[PDB]
Paper text:
The human p53 tumor suppressor is a 393-residue protein that in response to cellular stress, acts as a transcription factor by binding as a tetramer to a wide range of DNA response elements, activating various events including DNA repair, cell-cycle arrest, senescence or apoptosis. Mutations in the p53 gene were observed in more than half of human cancers. To uncover the structural basis of rescuing p53 mutants by MQ we investigated by X-ray crystallography high-resolution structures of the core domains of mutant and wild-type p53 bound to MQ in the absence and/or the presence of their DNA response elements. These studies reveal diverse binding modes of MQ to specific cysteine residues that stabilize the proteins and their interaction with DNA.
C273 residue is unique among the p53 cysteins by being a result of a DNA-contact hotspot mutation common in human cancer. Interestingly, this residue is extensively modified in all eight monomers of the two R273C-MQ structures. C273 is located in a shallow depression at the protein surface surrounded by residues from several regions of the protein, and hence providing an attractive target for the reactivation of R273C by a small drug molecule. In all monomers, a pivotal hydrogen bond is present between the tertiary amine of MQ and the amino group of K132, being further supported by the negatively charged E285 side chain. Other stabilizing interactions include direct and water-mediated hydrogen bonds and CH···O interactions of MQ with neighboring residues from other regions (S240, R248, I251, E271 and V272). It is noteworthy that MQ bound to C273 is present at high occupancy levels in all p53 monomers of the two types of structures, R273C-MQ (I, II), obtained by the two different procedures. Each MQ bound to C273 is located in a depression at the protein surface and not interfering with crystallization, as well as showing extensive stabilization by intramolecular interactions with the surrounding p53 residues. In the current crystal structures of MQ-bound p53 mutants, only two of the four monomers (B and C) show MQ-C182 conjugates.
Numbering used by the authors:
A (entry chain C): 96 to 182, 185 to 288
B (entry chain B): 97 to 183, 186 to 288
C (entry chain A): 96 to 181, 184 to 288
D (entry chain D): 95 to 182, 185 to 289
The structure:
């Protein structure tokens, strides 16, 4: 029906972090803590940090899924528009909005019962002298895409799961994929 | 040795596979990274046919296994003596690859190369869908003693017209194993 | 052609298991994982477990055969000492080292060409509560019997075959038949 | 009762346990609480347990470890790994066994044929030249929190010294918590008092 977006830090103290990028014209990805909202460009690197209080064990996986924010649209699967879904696809299904770049162990799922799309990578701990793990996501349509997201806001849900799929952690953030993230962030904050 | 050269041809013939993931319970899962299908003995292994334009009536779709390794490549891929034992329906008992849920299936023992293949009529996608799905079954395990014996194989898929002329070709590696999800997840860890 | 001792799990994921019996004076059979060696008493029950990932068909058979481990003895048939051959249960040939107890469908072979002894039983799936199938082997000579094994080490080769004789899998283990299995395991491990 | 004996006894060799004074820093993988007689440790990591004696036991002496549930309503339940961790093995240990010994090739595992309890045994070796106690490195192979396993029930490890013929010589015990953050979990449990 609808996957849960309820924040769940769980046993490992799972939290998300984001670079402090600002709102200048050069910025290709910028997070608003006031809005809990990422502003990023089509197909460009979006860094997401995983912060934990304890290290989950090897075989832990990190999954990302998008849903529609508005209750009227929430049961609709978030997918790429017909224009963009036309098969640079590498290892990714052409319909999927969310890709991970720079990870050979990436796995993509079409849920056989919910038909929802997700992308999964193995959780790796931070490098020694590092405090967080970084996944580079790419968003493969614009929020404005006719016949896809069509200006409807989306949430990204990031779940930590054990090797059997059981929930260990869940966080979420709103996403706008737009041409001018710095400008769009600064304008959306000024209201 | 049968040609394994990718050939989209005149109708833009491509293969697709479900995005099944690697849950322990999955019956069949394809690794885009390895171009490799992981599936269970005698269970459904869906293969999608995608075309840019519709092949003419009487087009056929053939599947044939060969060994991947150079020094096993002339050897005909067939079931182990244990599994070859009769028990089979429309399929020859020695054939590794079957098609299920197609009453028009045809099986060939090449009288000259002795290779096994399985053929069906090409049907366009059903109402609503963008691809044609063929349910293959692999009737030995990759680890069968006296059969494949842990040796890797490729499946070659060919689109042919009514007269047996080549229209398209593609291929993928196959592992027939107890737990496809685990085995894909493990093989991808390198 | 000395029989093959090469391990094959095969289509059914065939391996061997043994009870974790310890080395107390009272123990009648104990297996050493570090030595891959079973220590047992003359004529006493020696449980050997069959573990499979997938159930082979009814009609599947399980064969045991002993061979000398040392290369210069490998071509000699392993058989009971003169004393011990001269006792029988009424199914076992008096020269066979390995019997199966508590199985009315046991079959014994003297190979027409090699002259090697083996004992076969039907494969049955695990009983309810169990993840493995247990065969009770009896070894009918002592390792030290002069005129039989005469302290020469031996392997038992366990083969899983179908109703038609086709080989499905193989595994093996070393055996010592002795008065005090617990003490001999403890002593041999202590190198 | 049916449950095996937990009562402390130093016996003839004056047998007792010791534990390193490791503190509670975030990096610590195991830490013992003298106030709680309780060892906090991480899944599958080294857990040093010291054997202290007044006189040297004969060669052939053995040191056995066994886990029991602490709470009287669970005491008769055999302690074993959860079904998930049973599926994950060094080839010497049974996959169901909670307690392993690391780095001892003479290790022996027992499944009791009548109690069905698990235990792990090693030979007693005297202290090396320039040491005053023998150290065994235990590994605990399931979390305290594991569902279908300990399921948050506290356990005791019972350490027995026994002769070559199985005669009990001494017995000691300690509570154990297998957790993600031993340092943090020891501090929190000590501050309720
Ligand atoms: C891979 C696993 C197994 O080992 C059996 C068959 C399929 N899944 C679930 C049980
Ligand atoms: C990116 C931008 C849009 O196009 C609408 C949805 C999300 N965000 C606000 C309005
Ligand atoms: C475009 C289409 C194809 O033809 C294959 C690659 C991606 N997509 C599904 C299968
Ligand atoms: C087993 C054998 C038969 O008896 C007929 C069907 C299949 N195979 C060939 C002919
Ligand atoms: C399934 C697995 C095997 O058993 C061999 C062939 C293919 N794959 C790698 C090796
Ligand atoms: C049982 C014991 C013996 O008697 C010799 C052969 C195997 N093992 C070691 C030496
Ligand atoms: C580690 C912790 C737990 O999870 C329960 C048992 C022992 N300790 C206290 C409660
Ligand atoms: Zn788009
Ligand atoms: Zn086979
Ligand atoms: Zn004898
Ligand atoms: Zn566990």
């Amino acid at each position: 029906s609808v996957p849960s977006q309820k924040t769940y830090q769980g046993s490992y103290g799972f939290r998300l972090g984001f670079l402090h990028s600002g709102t200048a014209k050069s910025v290709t990805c910028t997070y608003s803590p006031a809005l809990n909202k990422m502003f990023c460009q089509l197909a460009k690197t979006c860094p997401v940090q995983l912060w934990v209080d304890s290290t989950p064990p090897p075989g832990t996986r990190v999954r990302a899924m998008a849903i529609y924010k508005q209750s009227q649209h929430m049961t609709e699967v978030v997918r790429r528009c017909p224009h963009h879904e036309r098969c640079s696809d590498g290892l990714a299904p052409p319909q999927h909005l969310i890709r991970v770049e720079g990870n050979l162990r990436v796995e993509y799922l079409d849920d056989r019962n919910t038909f929802r799309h997700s992308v999964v990578v193995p959780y790796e701990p931070p490098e020694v002298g590092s405090d967080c793990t970084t996944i580079h996501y790419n968003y493969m349509c614009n929020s404005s895409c006719m016949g896809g997201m069509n200006r409807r806001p989306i949430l990204t849900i990031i779940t930590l799961e054990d090797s059997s799929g059981n929930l260990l952690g869940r966080n979420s953030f709103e996403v706008c994929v737009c041409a001018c993230p710095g400008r769009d962030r600064r304008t959306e904050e000024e209201n």
